[PDB]
Design a protein around this ligand. Structure first.
Ligand SMILES: Cc1cn([C@H]2C[C@H](OP(=O)(O)O)[C@@H](COP(=O)(O)O)O2)c(=O)[nH]c1=O
Ligand SMILES: [Ca+2]
Length: 129
């Protein structure tokens, strides 16, 4: 896989963000994770965590997997990096998302995510508390 440039347009919630990619505004949905909706327990914390991570970054990058790049809603499907740190993995490591929506051929980083989730679960963090 490879990283491509993007710039933040607006944080949306724990697992979605508006980026400009190849000069076009797009909503991106993070691969392999499920954050609680804003109305749900840990939803506000998930949204705040992802907001702070993308707003604080000097450099946002997008990394598509090998399969589908857009979902049925037109959202891009990617791993998102803030100054080289993967947002998808960080949400797992903090107990603010569950590994979810793992479709064959778009799951390059599954085991990295599950590892992070196991560590969060060990620590009883957030969703696992
Ligand atoms: C993460 C992801 C979600 N989706 C679709 C499945 C779900 O469809 P339904 O809307 O029919 O449930 C929806 C969940 O996204 P959200 O968790 O953003 O709601 O997005 C994909 O198709 N591919 C993906 O890789
Ligand atoms: Ca969600």
């Amino acid at each position: 896989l490879h990283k491509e440039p993007a710039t933040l347009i607006a944080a949306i919630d724990g697992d979605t963000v508006k980026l400009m990619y190849k000069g076009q505004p797009m909503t991106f949905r993070l691969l392999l994770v499920d954050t609680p909706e804003f109305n749900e327990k840990y939803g506000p914390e998930a949204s705040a965590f992802t907001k702070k991570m993308v707003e604080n970054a000097k450099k946002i990058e997008v990394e598509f997997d090998k399969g589908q790049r857009t979902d049925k809603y037109g959202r891009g499907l990617a791993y998102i990096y803030a100054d080289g740190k993967m947002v998808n993995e960080a949400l797992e490591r903090q107990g603010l998302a569950k590994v979810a929506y793992v479709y064959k051929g778009n799951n390059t980083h599954e085991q990295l995510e599950r590892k992070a989730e196991a560590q969060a679960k060990k620590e009883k963090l957030n969703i696992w508390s």
